[PDB]
């Protein structure tokens, strides 16, 4: 039942030292990051997860720079940050899955090159 402020796609060029893929939930209502879980899929496979209960993040080897700002989760921001290299090497559709206790939701954003 988590609602998102949907974004169809985001463009980036080589001048982006840091590439951000937006993910924003509008009905977030947790007061502690322990009850939040975040998962970012790319072409099906998970390329970034955040267990708020364990307070740990996981990334595959080809996505070594993927990270989200945990300070912004309670306010609904689960945007995925990475570097230009991980960006040029991973162009396509990303999925943002956010869990808050029993509630959950997903949104799709395409990463394109200009």
């Amino acid at each position, epitope marked *: *039942q*988590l*609602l998102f402020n949907k974004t169809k796609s985001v463009d980036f060029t080589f001048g982006n030292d840091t590439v951000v893929i937006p993910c924003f939930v509008t*009905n977030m209502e947790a007061q502690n990051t322990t*009850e939040v879980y975040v*998962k970012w899929k790319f072409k099906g496979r998970d390329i970034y997860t955040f267990d708020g209960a364990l307070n740990k993040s996981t990334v595959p080897t080809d996505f070594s720079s993927a990270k989200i700002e945990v300070s912004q989760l309670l306010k609904g921001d689960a945007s995925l940050k990475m570097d230009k290299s991980d960006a040029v090497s991973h162009t396509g559709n990303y999925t943002c899955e956010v869990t808050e*206790l029993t*509630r*959950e939701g*997903e949104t799709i954003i395409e990463l394109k090159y200009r």
Partner: antibody, heavy 117, light 113 residues
Framework: QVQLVQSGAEVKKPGASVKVSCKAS????????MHWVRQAPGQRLEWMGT????????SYNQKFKDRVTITADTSASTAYMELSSLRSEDTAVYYC??????????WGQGTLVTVSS | GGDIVMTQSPLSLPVTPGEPASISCRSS???????????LGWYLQKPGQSPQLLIY???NRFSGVPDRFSGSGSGTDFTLKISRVEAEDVGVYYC?????????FGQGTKLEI
């Protein structure tokens, strides 16, 4: 203080219809699903269906196809479950439960529905 | 549209306070949804009360539940574990799956002293 309040118990003759209400309070009604679970006396819990009051998107158990309608009033923070063509196997306690898409957390006190003769 | 057979053993579990307890729940098919999550929940129905949520997503404790209850498992095998049984834990326990419609519960385990 999340609290789900349902209508009073009901007794109906076989073939009639019941409509059980479920008043929600203590949370935002439009950012939570509402589920409806029944339990025949001395049996297991049975999931009947769910609804998302944001766009009245329902998902139903096909066992109750064309018999159950789960509606919602967002301005009243209330959900409803209407079961028609009642038979004897429908005598059960009918619970509403808040929760997400695929799990329930807080339940109502249940509504007893007795199908007589 | 087919029920996923949720089977719980034992059906009855007597135990003295402080002694640990363990309930197993097996499903006919995999509770792994298409997104990789497993939507297996655990519900306690204390006698004379409505059901209440204990564990969601196999292992995640709910808000007010004590640290005694522990959920675990994967695939089709799931286990609920109580480290120290208290006098307020008496009731009927239901495992539940929310991956495949229709959502199906277990048979029920009656906990008692």
């Amino acid at each position: 203080q999340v609290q789900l309040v349902q209508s009073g118990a009901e007794v109906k003759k076989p073939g009639a219809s019941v409509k059980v209400s479920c008043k929600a309070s203590g949370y935002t009604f439009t950012n939570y699903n509402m589920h409806w679970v029944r339990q025949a006396p001395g049996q297991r819990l049975e999931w009947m269906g769910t609804i998302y009051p944001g766009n009245d998107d329902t998902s139903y158990n096909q066992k109750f196809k064309d018999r159950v309608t789960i509606t919602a009033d967002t301005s009243a923070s209330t959900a409803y479950m209407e079961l028609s063509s009642l038979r004897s196997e429908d005598t059960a306690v009918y619970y509403c439960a808040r929760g997400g898409y695929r799990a329930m957390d807080y339940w109502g006190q249940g509504t007893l529905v007795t199908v007589s003769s | 549209g087919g029920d996923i057979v949720m089977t719980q053993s034992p059906l009855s579990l007597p135990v003295t306070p402080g002694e640990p307890a363990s309930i197993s729940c097996r499903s006919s098919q995999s509770i792994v949804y298409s997104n990789g999550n497993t939507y297996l929940g655990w519900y306690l129905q204390k006698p004379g009360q409505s059901p209440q949520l204990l564990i969601y997503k196999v292992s995640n404790r709910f808000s007010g539940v004590p640290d005694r209850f522990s959920g675990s498992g994967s695939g089709t095998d799931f286990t609920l574990k109580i480290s120290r049984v208290e006098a307020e834990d008496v009731g009927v326990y239901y495992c539940f799956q929310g991956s495949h419609v229709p959502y199906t519960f277990g048979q029920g385990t009656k906990l008692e002293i």
